[PDB]
Amino acid sequence: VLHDGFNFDPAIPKADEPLTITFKAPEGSNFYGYADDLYLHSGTGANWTGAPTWGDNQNKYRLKKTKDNVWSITLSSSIRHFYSVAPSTPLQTINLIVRDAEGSQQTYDYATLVEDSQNGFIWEEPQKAPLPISGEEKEGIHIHSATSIMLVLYDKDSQGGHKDCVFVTGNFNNWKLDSRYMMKYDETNHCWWITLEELTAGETQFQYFVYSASDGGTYLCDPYCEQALEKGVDTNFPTGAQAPYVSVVSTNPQPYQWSAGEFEMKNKENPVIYELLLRDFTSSGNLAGAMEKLPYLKELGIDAIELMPVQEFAGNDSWGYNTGLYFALDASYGTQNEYKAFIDACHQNGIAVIFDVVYNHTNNDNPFARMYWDTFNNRPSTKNPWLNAVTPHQKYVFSPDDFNHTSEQTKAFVKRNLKYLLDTYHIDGFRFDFTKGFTQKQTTGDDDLAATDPARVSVLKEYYEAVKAVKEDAMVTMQHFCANEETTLATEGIHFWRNMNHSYCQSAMGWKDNSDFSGLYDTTRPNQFVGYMESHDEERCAYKQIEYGNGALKTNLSERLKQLSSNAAFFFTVPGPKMLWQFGEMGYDISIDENGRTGKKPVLWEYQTERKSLVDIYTKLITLRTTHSDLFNASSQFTWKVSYNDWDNGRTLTLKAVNGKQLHVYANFTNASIDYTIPEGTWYLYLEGNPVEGEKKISVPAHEFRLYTNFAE
Ligand SMILES: OC[C@H]1O[C@H](OC[C@H]2O[C@H](O[C@H]3[C@H](O)[C@@H](O)[C@@H](O[C@H]4[C@H](O)[C@@H](O)[C@@H](O[C@H]5[C@H](O)[C@@H](O)[C@@H](O[C@H]6[C@H](O)[C@@H](O)[C@@H](O)O[C@@H]6CO)O[C@@H]5CO)O[C@@H]4CO)O[C@@H]3CO)[C@H](O)[C@@H](O)[C@@H]2O[C@H]2O[C@H](CO)[C@@H](O)[C@H](O)[C@H]2O)[C@H](O)[C@@H](O)[C@@H]1O
Ligand SMILES: OC[C@H]1O[C@H](O[C@H]2[C@H](O)[C@@H](O)[C@@H](O[C@H]3[C@H](O)[C@@H](O)[C@@H](O[C@H]4[C@H](O)[C@@H](O)[C@@H](O[C@H]5[C@H](O)[C@@H](O)[C@@H](O)O[C@@H]5CO)O[C@@H]4CO)O[C@@H]3CO)O[C@@H]2CO)[C@H](O)[C@@H](O)[C@@H]1O
Ligand SMILES: OC[C@H]1O[C@H](O[C@H]2[C@H](O)[C@@H](O)[C@@H](O[C@H]3[C@H](O)[C@@H](O)[C@@H](O[C@H]4[C@H](O)[C@@H](O)[C@@H](O[C@H]5[C@H](O)[C@@H](O)[C@@H](O)O[C@@H]5CO)O[C@@H]4CO)O[C@@H]3CO)O[C@@H]2CO)[C@H](O)[C@@H](O)[C@@H]1O
Ligand SMILES: [Ca+2]
Ligand SMILES: [Mn+2]
């Protein structure tokens, strides 16, 4: 009798006996009805000792077809002799891939356990025992003492099944599988657990080996670790450990001393948000480099820094939209305490901190993925309780590992992670990446995906309410781009990205086509829409000038900075929260496609002095929202003429406070001077408080604006 996949004679592989491996292709699978022989790509232990060169078709690697959909191979003399393993090396796992002769079609990483009598690895029945703790955050790493930690690993698949055993391996047992480090299973709580005793204080490194007869075994780290080494990044990644991740825990942490107490976001109803990628914001690409620039951002007058994703992402050179671990921040930007110090410094400068967080998808490195994996199709198992096997929204497939947001396990994980980041890092709110992806509906395009999904609306409220329960003044922004759902969710106090990049690129270039600014201001709830001329996802307004500008806007820096300054006068002057992408204030004009869309960008701090005239305008316009905040109250009456038809005679905006304060802006986006009659009144050129007669007529040069207040300071 044969199960689907790999079968073993002897049933329990023995390191020092021969082994017959029989592979049975399951129905639908890619070798189902395959006619020819298959080949074995295999090796022992974490790093596949003795693996051949991919495609080596020596007879010793041939699996003979013995029946329909059944192939067999014998590892002769012994397993140890087959892989040339030394007699005193514990041989505890065998990793198996079957492939065609061409090395084109294949199965994916699988392992089984090997008993090594000769070296003292004898199998034992795993014990059942009750979890000795209770409560809502049972899973993960509990520091019991300087010398002991309890590990708790959730294990229940979507078919109600679980693994057969779990070993903990690490620096404490030289990365071996050992019967003393077998976790006990609690069937009521659906958790493996163990206490590691007799650790030396300092740093414990570990991973799990999880095993079932039906799934085989796999190495994975703890999803709740706060610190991880990643193989290919950390030079000290342990030799005995398998890629990708090793969990790190200190039983004696040096705990960060937070300054003073109580931080509140300034201008909290309508903040100016600076979107920052640590990788490209400074030459050092890290927190320490960014910390040197907090004085610059404070003077700029911003209310909040939005950090592009800092949760552990694949490798160390990324935008961050490829999260492998959610409770560990990426050590390429710095240590846990450097993240706290950076956030503390922001706070001490008056600046809030928002984390960009990515819950649509994770990657193949996530323990949640590795726990229940399909080794035939290289994607999450259909039994995976957190992840979809196949992305429901086929228009947008950013990784193989799409979260199921109708899973209770997924929802509990996201809420616990949002609470963790608020409690540990003292952050001020969240920008949720791609909330449109929090859906189980089968779709193939933009319109079917964008149609209302009441379950998507419902889970986004749940996530919002979970954040508010922890910090009632936390700012929750969602990158959604689904109009009907945004109306419902904006009513609850959720903020939404309002993408005005297209219009302000067109105006920056001097093209009136599709230049309508009006989408920046939602007339119903202007404070719920975070409007931007630029984001990390879009082309730079100052780059489009160079590539496609009308006339002098291609070549004349002076004129380009005037036009970008006029854009800003039609942006920071508008009620509701606003976002700028790093260096827009200094006319950053490298194409998004330079060095590839997500590639490292040039770091051009010399632009801060060479385009200081634009930095000054941004600073004054942003600072105006602090010094005259009563003007930008959403109660203020706001009117503007910013359509396709508002061009040859200028664009206008007037903002009128209930207390009688007024702001008026005129701009000429054209390539020629235009005559304008200032509206009636006594006006000051606030960016210069020198008075100006209203009902008076001026010539406004190409690309320039005039800003007027009916107050002098
Ligand atoms: O380490 C390897 C590698 O991994 C990474 O790559 C992952 C991807 O990252 C990036 O994509 C991100 C965005 O940055 C993020 O902001 C977010 O953006 C999504 C939106 O959430 C989603 O809604 C959708 O937007 C659509 C929109 O829905 C639709 O309605 C319309 O909207 C317009 C409208 O048409 C218009 O009228 C106007 O009103 O404005 C609207 C707003 O635009 O069109 C929108 C845009 O199409 O899509 C966007 C993204 O475009 O979420 C994603 C993912 O979290 C990168 O931009 C992307 O290139 C990366 O994918 C790359 O890598 C993948 C595998 O690794 C691969 O599958 C993919 O093909 C490949 O290109 C890291 O971040 C890298 O740094 C790293 O090296
Ligand atoms: O420090 C030791 C060592 O560590 C790292 O390599 C080890 C891996 O971390 C470990 O997983 C294991 O690698 C396995 C691999 O996981 C497994 O999938 C298989 O790899 C096959 C692919 O399956 C197969 O498709 C083919 O891959 C091609 C790929 O198709 C092609 O598109 C292109 O990208 O190149 C690939 C390479 O030929 O072949 C590979 C096998 O080559 O088997 C692997 C084991 O052989 O063990 C690795 C070695 O210990 C580090 O990456 C390595 O530098 C370090 O020396
Ligand atoms: O009346 C005759 C003429 O009128 C119209 O064309 C003129 C436009 O009205 C005018 O604004 C100006 O066009 C600008 C355009 O507004 C501006 O955006 C820029 O266009 C660039 C894009 O910015 C750039 O991204 C790229 O667009 C590509 C895109 O990358 C690609 O993926 C795909 O979508 O195709 C697009 C090209 O179709 O390149 C364009 C440049 O082609 O600069 C434009 C001017 O260079 O000038 C137009 C006349 O030159 C009508 O549109 C036209 O049909 C009539 O013939
Ligand atoms: Ca990383
Ligand atoms: Mn999704």
Tab-separated table of N, CA and C in Angstrom, residues 391-475:
chain	number	residue	atom	x	y	z
A	391	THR	N	-4.262	32.921	-4.947
A	391	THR	CA	-4.753	34.299	-4.706
A	391	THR	C	-6.144	34.419	-5.330
A	392	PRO	N	-7.187	34.798	-4.574
A	392	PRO	CA	-8.523	34.980	-5.160
A	392	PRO	C	-8.622	36.111	-6.206
A	393	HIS	N	-7.920	37.226	-5.966
A	393	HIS	CA	-7.918	38.450	-6.813
A	393	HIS	C	-6.764	38.355	-7.810
A	394	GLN	N	-7.008	37.737	-8.965
A	394	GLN	CA	-5.922	37.288	-9.884
A	394	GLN	C	-5.328	38.480	-10.639
A	395	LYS	N	-5.993	39.623	-10.620
A	395	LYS	CA	-5.425	40.869	-11.166
A	395	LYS	C	-4.162	41.267	-10.386
A	396	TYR	N	-4.089	40.986	-9.083
A	396	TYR	CA	-3.000	41.460	-8.192
A	396	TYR	C	-2.473	40.306	-7.346
A	397	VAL	N	-1.397	39.695	-7.854
A	397	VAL	CA	-0.703	38.543	-7.227
A	397	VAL	C	0.732	38.963	-6.922
A	398	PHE	N	1.000	39.458	-5.715
A	398	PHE	CA	2.306	40.095	-5.406
A	398	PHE	C	3.254	39.077	-4.784
A	399	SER	N	2.721	37.946	-4.345
A	399	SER	CA	3.519	36.831	-3.795
A	399	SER	C	2.656	35.586	-3.848
A	400	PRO	N	3.220	34.387	-3.639
A	400	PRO	CA	2.417	33.172	-3.593
A	400	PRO	C	1.541	33.014	-2.329
A	401	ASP	N	1.639	33.944	-1.361
A	401	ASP	CA	1.180	33.780	0.047
A	401	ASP	C	0.207	34.895	0.414
A	402	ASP	N	-1.009	34.772	-0.105
A	402	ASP	CA	-2.113	35.732	0.084
A	402	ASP	C	-2.855	35.361	1.364
A	403	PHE	N	-3.017	36.284	2.302
A	403	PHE	CA	-3.745	36.005	3.563
A	403	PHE	C	-5.241	35.838	3.279
A	404	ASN	N	-5.854	34.873	3.972
A	404	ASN	CA	-7.329	34.750	4.017
A	404	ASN	C	-7.837	35.599	5.180
A	405	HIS	N	-8.426	36.760	4.875
A	405	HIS	CA	-8.923	37.686	5.923
A	405	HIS	C	-10.295	37.256	6.434
A	406	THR	N	-10.845	36.122	6.003
A	406	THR	CA	-12.066	35.525	6.627
A	406	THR	C	-11.663	34.446	7.628
A	407	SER	N	-10.382	34.072	7.687
A	407	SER	CA	-9.846	33.158	8.724
A	407	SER	C	-9.804	33.882	10.064
A	408	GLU	N	-10.335	33.244	11.099
A	408	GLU	CA	-10.274	33.727	12.493
A	408	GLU	C	-8.807	33.766	12.930
A	409	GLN	N	-8.011	32.783	12.514
A	409	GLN	CA	-6.566	32.751	12.871
A	409	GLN	C	-5.891	34.010	12.286
A	410	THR	N	-6.170	34.349	11.030
A	410	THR	CA	-5.576	35.528	10.383
A	410	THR	C	-6.006	36.786	11.121
A	411	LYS	N	-7.303	36.934	11.362
A	411	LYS	CA	-7.837	38.155	12.025
A	411	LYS	C	-7.179	38.311	13.394
A	412	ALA	N	-7.045	37.232	14.171
A	412	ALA	CA	-6.485	37.307	15.549
A	412	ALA	C	-5.008	37.722	15.470
A	413	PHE	N	-4.284	37.163	14.503
A	413	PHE	CA	-2.864	37.501	14.212
A	413	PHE	C	-2.714	38.991	13.875
A	414	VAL	N	-3.526	39.525	12.974
A	414	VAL	CA	-3.385	40.949	12.552
A	414	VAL	C	-3.646	41.854	13.762
A	415	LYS	N	-4.702	41.588	14.531
A	415	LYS	CA	-5.076	42.465	15.681
A	415	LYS	C	-3.958	42.442	16.724
A	416	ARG	N	-3.389	41.250	16.937
A	416	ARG	CA	-2.342	41.071	17.967
A	416	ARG	C	-1.092	41.819	17.502
A	417	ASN	N	-0.808	41.788	16.191
A	417	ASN	CA	0.369	42.468	15.604
A	417	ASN	C	0.171	43.987	15.717
A	418	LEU	N	-1.022	44.500	15.398
A	418	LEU	CA	-1.322	45.965	15.493
A	418	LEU	C	-1.130	46.423	16.946
A	419	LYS	N	-1.631	45.646	17.890
A	419	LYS	CA	-1.450	45.949	19.333
A	419	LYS	C	0.029	45.891	19.698
A	420	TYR	N	0.756	44.879	19.241
A	420	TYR	CA	2.195	44.744	19.564
A	420	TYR	C	2.955	46.003	19.131
A	421	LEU	N	2.746	46.449	17.886
A	421	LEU	CA	3.529	47.578	17.317
A	421	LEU	C	3.165	48.853	18.089
A	422	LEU	N	1.889	49.047	18.464
A	422	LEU	CA	1.465	50.218	19.291
A	422	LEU	C	2.163	50.124	20.659
A	423	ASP	N	2.115	48.974	21.340
A	423	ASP	CA	2.626	48.804	22.738
A	423	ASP	C	4.156	48.871	22.771
A	424	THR	N	4.851	48.292	21.794
A	424	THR	CA	6.333	48.167	21.841
A	424	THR	C	7.006	49.424	21.290
A	425	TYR	N	6.517	49.938	20.166
A	425	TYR	CA	7.247	50.961	19.385
A	425	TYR	C	6.614	52.343	19.622
A	426	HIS	N	5.495	52.431	20.358
A	426	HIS	CA	4.855	53.710	20.778
A	426	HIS	C	4.510	54.546	19.541
A	427	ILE	N	4.115	53.901	18.455
A	427	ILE	CA	3.847	54.612	17.170
A	427	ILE	C	2.447	55.230	17.233
A	428	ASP	N	2.147	56.089	16.259
A	428	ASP	CA	1.031	57.063	16.299
A	428	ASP	C	-0.091	56.622	15.373
A	429	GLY	N	0.180	55.630	14.522
A	429	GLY	CA	-0.826	55.049	13.626
A	429	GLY	C	-0.206	54.227	12.520
A	430	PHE	N	-1.023	53.903	11.541
A	430	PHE	CA	-0.774	52.818	10.568
A	430	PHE	C	-1.260	53.271	9.213
A	431	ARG	N	-0.505	52.884	8.205
A	431	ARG	CA	-0.980	52.938	6.822
A	431	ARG	C	-1.072	51.483	6.386
A	432	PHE	N	-2.277	50.995	6.146
A	432	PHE	CA	-2.500	49.625	5.640
A	432	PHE	C	-2.352	49.632	4.133
A	433	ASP	N	-1.316	48.932	3.668
A	433	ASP	CA	-1.067	48.593	2.252
A	433	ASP	C	-2.216	47.766	1.679
A	434	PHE	N	-2.663	48.119	0.477
A	434	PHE	CA	-3.504	47.260	-0.411
A	434	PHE	C	-4.646	46.575	0.342
A	435	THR	N	-5.486	47.373	0.994
A	435	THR	CA	-6.656	46.875	1.768
A	435	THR	C	-7.715	46.315	0.815
A	436	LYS	N	-7.672	46.719	-0.456
A	436	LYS	CA	-8.529	46.149	-1.514
A	436	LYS	C	-8.301	44.633	-1.627
A	437	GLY	N	-7.100	44.163	-1.314
A	437	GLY	CA	-6.759	42.734	-1.348
A	437	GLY	C	-7.337	41.935	-0.182
A	438	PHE	N	-7.998	42.542	0.803
A	438	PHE	CA	-8.504	41.774	1.975
A	438	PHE	C	-9.846	41.159	1.588
A	439	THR	N	-9.860	40.253	0.609
A	439	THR	CA	-11.103	39.738	-0.019
A	439	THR	C	-10.873	38.293	-0.454
A	440	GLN	N	-11.923	37.460	-0.345
A	440	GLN	CA	-11.924	36.036	-0.741
A	440	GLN	C	-12.670	35.857	-2.057
A	441	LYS	N	-13.275	36.903	-2.624
A	441	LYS	CA	-14.045	36.728	-3.871
A	441	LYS	C	-13.079	36.387	-5.002
A	442	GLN	N	-13.491	35.474	-5.875
A	442	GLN	CA	-12.777	35.130	-7.128
A	442	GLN	C	-12.992	36.246	-8.158
A	443	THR	N	-11.935	36.954	-8.546
A	443	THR	CA	-11.992	38.061	-9.537
A	443	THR	C	-10.761	37.984	-10.428
A	444	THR	N	-10.804	38.609	-11.603
A	444	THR	CA	-9.717	38.559	-12.620
A	444	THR	C	-9.294	39.957	-13.104
A	445	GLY	N	-9.970	41.034	-12.702
A	445	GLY	CA	-9.773	42.394	-13.249
A	445	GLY	C	-9.864	43.475	-12.178
A	446	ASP	N	-10.054	44.726	-12.573
A	446	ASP	CA	-10.154	45.872	-11.632
A	446	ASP	C	-11.601	46.096	-11.148
A	447	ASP	N	-12.598	45.993	-12.025
A	447	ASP	CA	-14.012	46.354	-11.707
A	447	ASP	C	-14.654	45.305	-10.788
A	448	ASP	N	-14.457	44.022	-11.050
A	448	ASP	CA	-15.028	42.939	-10.195
A	448	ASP	C	-14.366	42.991	-8.811
A	449	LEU	N	-13.060	43.266	-8.752
A	449	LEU	CA	-12.339	43.384	-7.460
A	449	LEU	C	-12.835	44.618	-6.699
A	450	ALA	N	-13.040	45.730	-7.413
A	450	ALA	CA	-13.398	47.041	-6.814
A	450	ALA	C	-14.877	47.071	-6.421
A	451	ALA	N	-15.722	46.191	-6.939
A	451	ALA	CA	-17.132	46.069	-6.494
A	451	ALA	C	-17.163	45.807	-4.988
A	452	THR	N	-18.183	46.328	-4.303
A	452	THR	CA	-18.293	46.267	-2.828
A	452	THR	C	-18.235	44.798	-2.416
A	453	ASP	N	-17.430	44.483	-1.407
A	453	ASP	CA	-17.360	43.155	-0.761
A	453	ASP	C	-17.646	43.427	0.701
A	454	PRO	N	-18.884	43.156	1.161
A	454	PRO	CA	-19.273	43.441	2.544
A	454	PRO	C	-18.370	42.817	3.619
A	455	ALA	N	-17.743	41.678	3.307
A	455	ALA	CA	-16.782	40.979	4.190
A	455	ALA	C	-15.471	41.771	4.289
A	456	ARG	N	-15.025	42.371	3.182
A	456	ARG	CA	-13.832	43.262	3.128
A	456	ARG	C	-14.095	44.509	3.972
A	457	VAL	N	-15.228	45.174	3.727
A	457	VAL	CA	-15.654	46.374	4.518
A	457	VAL	C	-15.654	45.966	5.992
A	458	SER	N	-16.209	44.795	6.273
A	458	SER	CA	-16.408	44.312	7.659
A	458	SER	C	-15.076	44.076	8.373
A	459	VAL	N	-14.111	43.456	7.690
A	459	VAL	CA	-12.813	43.121	8.344
A	459	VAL	C	-11.985	44.402	8.509
A	460	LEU	N	-12.108	45.342	7.588
A	460	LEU	CA	-11.389	46.632	7.711
A	460	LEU	C	-11.915	47.414	8.922
A	461	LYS	N	-13.229	47.412	9.184
A	461	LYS	CA	-13.764	48.023	10.435
A	461	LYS	C	-13.186	47.310	11.658
A	462	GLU	N	-13.131	45.973	11.633
A	462	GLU	CA	-12.632	45.163	12.777
A	462	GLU	C	-11.207	45.616	13.087
A	463	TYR	N	-10.378	45.742	12.046
A	463	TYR	CA	-8.944	46.090	12.213
A	463	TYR	C	-8.859	47.503	12.791
A	464	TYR	N	-9.640	48.416	12.219
A	464	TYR	CA	-9.762	49.814	12.711
A	464	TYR	C	-10.148	49.841	14.201
A	465	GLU	N	-11.198	49.111	14.566
A	465	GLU	CA	-11.712	49.103	15.965
A	465	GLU	C	-10.653	48.477	16.872
A	466	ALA	N	-9.877	47.485	16.384
A	466	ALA	CA	-8.818	46.841	17.214
A	466	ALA	C	-7.751	47.886	17.514
A	467	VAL	N	-7.413	48.731	16.540
A	467	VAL	CA	-6.390	49.787	16.748
A	467	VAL	C	-6.902	50.811	17.783
A	468	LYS	N	-8.137	51.282	17.595
A	468	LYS	CA	-8.793	52.300	18.468
A	468	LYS	C	-8.896	51.773	19.913
A	469	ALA	N	-9.158	50.484	20.123
A	469	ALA	CA	-9.268	49.856	21.463
A	469	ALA	C	-7.948	49.990	22.210
A	470	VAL	N	-6.824	50.011	21.501
A	470	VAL	CA	-5.473	50.096	22.120
A	470	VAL	C	-5.091	51.567	22.274
A	471	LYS	N	-5.360	52.403	21.269
A	471	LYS	CA	-4.968	53.837	21.297
A	471	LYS	C	-6.047	54.632	20.559
A	472	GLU	N	-6.945	55.300	21.306
A	472	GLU	CA	-8.182	55.874	20.700
A	472	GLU	C	-7.815	57.042	19.772
A	473	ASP	N	-6.646	57.664	19.918
A	473	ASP	CA	-6.177	58.771	19.035
A	473	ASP	C	-5.193	58.277	17.960
A	474	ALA	N	-5.097	56.974	17.676
A	474	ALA	CA	-4.186	56.470	16.628
A	474	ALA	C	-4.787	56.825	15.265
A	475	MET	N	-3.951	57.283	14.342
A	475	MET	CA	-4.378	57.535	12.947
A	475	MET	C	-4.326	56.227	12.149
